[PDB]
Short mmCIF file of C-alpha atoms in Angstrom, two decimals:
data_model
loop_
_atom_site.label_atom_id
_atom_site.label_comp_id
_atom_site.label_asym_id
_atom_site.label_seq_id
_atom_site.Cartn_x
_atom_site.Cartn_y
_atom_site.Cartn_z
CA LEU A 946 6.75 35.67 -24.49
CA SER A 947 4.76 36.19 -27.70
CA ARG A 948 1.40 37.39 -26.36
CA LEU A 949 2.46 39.11 -23.11
CA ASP A 950 4.54 42.24 -22.52
CA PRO A 951 7.77 41.76 -20.47
CA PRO A 952 6.55 43.42 -17.23
CA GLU A 953 3.66 40.95 -17.29
CA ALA A 954 5.70 37.97 -18.50
CA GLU A 955 8.37 38.10 -15.79
CA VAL A 956 5.85 37.32 -13.03
CA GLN A 957 5.07 33.91 -14.54
CA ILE A 958 8.69 33.38 -15.60
CA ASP A 959 9.71 33.53 -11.93
CA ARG A 960 7.26 30.73 -11.13
CA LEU A 961 8.38 28.45 -13.97
CA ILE A 962 12.03 28.94 -13.01
CA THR A 963 11.27 28.00 -9.40
CA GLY A 964 9.42 24.81 -10.31
CA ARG A 965 12.03 23.59 -12.77
CA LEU A 966 14.91 24.27 -10.37
CA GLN A 967 13.13 22.22 -7.71
CA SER A 968 12.60 19.28 -10.08
CA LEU A 969 16.25 19.18 -11.12
CA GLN A 970 17.28 19.23 -7.45
CA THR A 971 15.05 16.23 -6.73
CA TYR A 972 16.40 14.25 -9.69
CA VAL A 973 20.07 14.79 -8.90
CA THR A 974 19.56 14.00 -5.20
CA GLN A 975 17.95 10.63 -5.88
CA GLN A 976 20.64 9.94 -8.49
CA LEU A 977 23.33 10.26 -5.81
CA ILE A 978 21.32 7.92 -3.59
CA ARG A 979 21.23 5.22 -6.29
CA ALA A 980 24.93 5.52 -7.13
CA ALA A 981 25.97 4.29 -3.68
CA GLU A 982 23.89 1.11 -3.70
CA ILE A 983 25.29 0.24 -7.12
CA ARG A 984 28.84 0.95 -5.93
CA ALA A 985 28.47 -1.54 -3.08
CA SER A 986 27.40 -4.23 -5.54
CA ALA A 987 30.33 -3.44 -7.83
CA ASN A 988 32.63 -3.90 -4.84
CA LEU A 989 31.09 -7.26 -3.97
CA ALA A 990 31.38 -8.29 -7.62
CA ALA A 991 35.09 -7.45 -7.65
CA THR A 992 35.49 -9.47 -4.44
CA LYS A 993 33.80 -12.52 -5.96
CA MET A 994 35.91 -12.19 -9.12
CA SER A 995 39.12 -11.98 -7.08
CA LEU B 946 -12.02 28.83 5.45
CA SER B 947 -14.80 29.76 7.88
CA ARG B 948 -14.04 33.43 8.59
CA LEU B 949 -12.35 34.49 5.32
CA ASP B 950 -13.74 34.79 1.79
CA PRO B 951 -12.06 32.58 -0.89
CA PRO B 952 -10.14 35.38 -2.69
CA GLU B 953 -8.60 36.23 0.68
CA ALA B 954 -8.17 32.62 1.84
CA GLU B 955 -6.21 31.39 -1.18
CA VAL B 956 -3.26 33.69 -0.43
CA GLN B 957 -2.60 31.96 2.90
CA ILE B 958 -3.51 28.54 1.48
CA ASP B 959 -0.62 28.86 -0.98
CA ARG B 960 1.78 29.43 1.92
CA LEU B 961 0.55 26.49 3.99
CA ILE B 962 0.76 24.19 0.96
CA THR B 963 4.35 25.27 0.32
CA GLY B 964 5.49 24.66 3.89
CA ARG B 965 3.87 21.25 4.19
CA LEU B 966 5.25 20.07 0.85
CA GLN B 967 8.74 21.05 1.98
CA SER B 968 8.40 19.16 5.26
CA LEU B 969 7.27 15.96 3.55
CA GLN B 970 10.22 16.23 1.15
CA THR B 971 12.64 16.47 4.07
CA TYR B 972 11.12 13.49 5.87
CA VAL B 973 11.17 11.15 2.87
CA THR B 974 14.73 12.15 1.94
CA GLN B 975 16.14 11.32 5.36
CA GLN B 976 14.10 8.11 5.36
CA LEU B 977 15.92 6.95 2.22
CA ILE B 978 19.23 7.83 3.89
CA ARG B 979 18.44 5.63 6.90
CA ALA B 980 17.25 2.67 4.82
CA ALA B 981 20.71 2.15 3.31
CA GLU B 982 22.61 1.98 6.60
CA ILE B 983 20.09 -0.56 7.89
CA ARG B 984 20.39 -2.59 4.68
CA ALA B 985 24.16 -2.90 5.12
CA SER B 986 23.66 -4.26 8.63
CA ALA B 987 21.06 -6.75 7.40
CA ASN B 988 23.61 -7.96 4.84
CA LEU B 989 26.29 -8.39 7.49
CA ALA B 990 23.77 -10.23 9.67
CA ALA B 991 22.97 -12.66 6.86
CA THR B 992 26.70 -13.19 6.36
CA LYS B 993 27.24 -14.02 10.03
CA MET B 994 24.24 -16.36 10.00
CA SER B 995 25.54 -18.17 6.92
#
């Protein structure tokens, strides 16, 4: 942004936005995968407690 | 690579790399989905054995 004019900057900005969107998507997806296998253990724990 | 010069080749190479990355992502994601439903059956099997 400092050493390039906006018509030149936006071409790279599109690329950086694409990459960072993709990496957030991957993180959140795997986070939903993990949540389920922890939930099943919490349910077994509550069963053993009861 | 054989019949095109590198400045021309790289434009297609970017496209092929994008497609193949996407297809590996899809395969590994569904593979983690399957693993969980097999794990639950393995746990029920161990319960029945015990």
